[PDB]
Amino acid sequence: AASGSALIFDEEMSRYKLLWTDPECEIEVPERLTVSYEALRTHGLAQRCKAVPVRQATEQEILLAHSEEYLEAVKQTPGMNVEELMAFSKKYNAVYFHQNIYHCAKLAAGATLQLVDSVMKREVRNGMALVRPPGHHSQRSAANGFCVFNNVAFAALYAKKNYNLNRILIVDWDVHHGQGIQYCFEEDPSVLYFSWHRYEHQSFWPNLPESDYSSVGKGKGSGFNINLPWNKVGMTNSDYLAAFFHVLLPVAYEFDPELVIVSAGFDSAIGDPEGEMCALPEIFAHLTHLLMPLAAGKMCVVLEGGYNLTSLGQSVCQTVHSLLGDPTPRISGLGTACDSALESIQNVRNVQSSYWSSFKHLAQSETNIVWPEPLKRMPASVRTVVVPPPGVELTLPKNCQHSISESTAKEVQRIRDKHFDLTDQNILRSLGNIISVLDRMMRSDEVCNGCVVVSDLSVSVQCALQHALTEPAERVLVVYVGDGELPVKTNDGKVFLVQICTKETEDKCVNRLTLCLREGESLTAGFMQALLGLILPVAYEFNPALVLGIVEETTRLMRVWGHMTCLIQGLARGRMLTLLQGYDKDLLELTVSALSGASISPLGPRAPKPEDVEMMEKQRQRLQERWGLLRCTVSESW
Ligand SMILES: O=C(/C=C/C1CCN(CCc2c[nH]c3ccccc23)CC1)NO
Ligand SMILES: [K+]
Ligand SMILES: [K+]
Ligand SMILES: [Zn+2]
């Protein structure tokens, strides 16, 4: 299986610049590229990536997405002086040409195909291309908004032609609408395009009616274009995350893309003078993370906009950090999306309900500037510690390890005399393992998470949980698959309990979330809809310091467990301790692999049972006043 992350860059693409005064264009500078690469070298991240040489896109390749007439006209700009280059630029909207921009445009294009080839040939798992000029505004016969050729559109057309790909997801988190991408794929159901963007009721550039949420595609491609307009500036992490949990991820995991291309503009980051949003660079570590379980991790990130040289550097690093699998930063202060965002989110969901099954219940009323420096993100010495049953030896990935000092062994006796009596001398070894693994996770940056196999649940959960609280871990999120009650108090706001059961259980308070999904064929799609639209939004607002996973000895969800384990590592900087009751070679192989940061096997695209969606929306109704990040409609005033 593939390993590593590509980084495609070349100082040559910084060798074109604006040559006359023009305040429309004054912001697109060469320094964007060199600041971004220098931030990656300063943080050690460039050195950790496979450097892949840039190349030129050939003439045949440029014609995948552009007309001969336009290619011929651009081919002439290297022969042009400054008067002639100004005359040529004035024919297009918000774009300047330079003697060397045709050259760099072919480099920005070829660099993107270089990235597509490395990911699709399994030479890396994923990667990023720092390129200039950007692409996503470019159109079949026109330059637009600093873009000459449509790099991201090339990538999808090229991956279609040369790899026989059926499904390609393009995620455009630039703050501008990528209308060139939309035009190119509006009739193509094989490319799903998602774009959020500053719209301000069409008063923001490019001022297009088609940038609105009602453009869903055309013809055989309706439902594979999703526009999410931001109609106010100042959008926050909670707005961006709400867009992902309630619009983008439900749609993306059902589409099941074979490859993910990101138009990564960081003008949607705090401090940018074009986007004027308020999302912290760290959010891009999570935007990247939430997409990495798609398509076996095959993700190509292509740089677009980004104009505040400082936020630019930090958001680039948070993205590459997540591409290399480093632990994600904790996001604090999350809650409800703002009213304008909830209106936009609500309006997209309703128009898209004709096309996607996560939104289909909406259609019938039967069931309807300075900010703090981000912290350091070091990968653990050993990422994952595993404790299988005694004497069982397994094939472990290179970043895992097996696990009792005397310090820890006195503690187990201390606990035993007080609260248990019990003498089963190996469930006493399990609690030695639980404690020594927990001590390694929290006291150290050298171990990240861990999995322990246990036999007695309630004693194991008690010590795991109590040893985590009195450590201290501010909050613990507990995720439990099974039935019966455990020794967990949801009393204070220090524990939140997700439970996945089979018998229906009336919930009382807003610090427990109980999902009784009907067993059968639709169990897999229902679990994913709950994971994306209930569990992740609450977990993210709760902001736990530790995640405790617990599986009862019972099979039915061996298909979904790796996705959850991967996604849930967006909480608590990845510190998650999983207790498996009983030995299952394959469930344990699967848990360790997701915890180790390996690739997740895709699910493929069978729609969930309506009884299950009724159950999940009753849970949203019951929790969204305490947990605002669950909201995907505007609330009604008194
Ligand atoms: O991020 C990007 C970059 C997109 C660009 C889009 C176009 N505006 C130009 C703004 C503008 C239009 N008329 C003006 C008059 C005076 C001053 C300024 C302007 C700049 C950025 N693409 O992804
Ligand atoms: K966008
Ligand atoms: K499309
Ligand atoms: Zn932009």
Cβ–ligand 1 contact at 174 (below 6 Å)? yes
Distance (angstroms) between ligand 1 centre and the Cα of 230 equals 17
- For 61-101, list the strands marked E by DSSP: none
DSSP 13: G
Cβ–ligand 1 contact at 197 (below 6 Å)? no
Q: Which residue has the tokens 């279609």?
A: 160
The protein residue with its alpha carbon nearest to ligand 1, atom 12, reads: 24
Cβ–ligand 1 contact at 304 (below 6 Å)? yes
d(CA 462, CA 482): 16
Classify residue 277 as exposed, middle or buried by CB count within 10 Å of its CB (0-12, 13-18, 19+). buried
Q: Supply angle C-alpha 436, 441, 446, rounded to 5.
A: 110
CA distance readout (Å), 352 to 229, 246, 455, 527, 633:
14, 12, 47, 21, 14
Distance (angstroms) between ligand 1 centre and the Cα of 212 equals 19
**Half-sphere exposure (CA, 13 Å, Cβ side) for 227?**
27
CB 25 within 8 A of CB 18: yes
Q: 299 φ, ψ to 5°?
A: -130, 125
Chain centroid to CA 523 = 24
Tell me, yes or no, if 137 is annotated catalytic. Answer: yes
Asked whether the bond before 209 is cis by omega within 30 degrees of 0, the reply is no
CB 184 within 8 A of CB 190: no
Q: CA nearest 594: which of 604, 586, 605?
A: 586
In the three-class reduction of DSSP (H, G, I as helix; E, B as strand; rest coil), residue 4 is classed as coil
What are the residues whose beta carbons fall under 8 Å from the beta carbon of 466, sequence distance 6 or more?
A: none
- DSSP letters, 275-337, are T---B-THHHHHHHHHHTTGGGG-EEEEE-----HHHHHHHHHHHHHHHTTPPPPPPPS--PP
d(CA 126, CA 293): 12
**Which residues does a gap of C–N over 2.5 Å follow in the chain?**
368, 403, 420, 554, 605
With the C-alpha atoms ordered 351, 355, 360, 363, is the resulting torsion angle positive or negative?
positive
In the three-class reduction of DSSP (H, G, I as helix; E, B as strand; rest coil), residue 486 is classed as coil
d(CA 428, CA 548): 19
The experimental method, as deposited, was: X-ray
Cβ–ligand 1 contact at 23 (below 6 Å)? yes
d(CA 230, CA 345): 9
Q: Catalytic residue, from 43, 98, 137, 321: name it.
A: 137
d(CA 462, CA 328): 27
Distance (angstroms) between ligand 1 centre and the Cα of 205 equals 7
CB 234 within 8 A of CB 278: yes
- DSSP letters, 238-249, are HHHHHHIIIIIH
The edge-to-edge listing of strands for the beta sheet with 476-481 is 400-402, 382-387, 447-454, 576-581, 546-551, 476-481, 495-501, 512-516
Question: Which ligand 1 atom is the nearest neighbour of the CA of 305?
Answer: 1
d(CA 337, CA 317): 26
Cβ–ligand 1 contact at 267 (below 6 Å)? yes
Q: Which residues of 590-620 are buried (b: 16+ CB within 10 A; e: fewer)?
A: bbbbbbbbbbbebbeeebbbeebbebbbebb
Q: CA nearest 542: which of 513, 504, 506?
A: 513
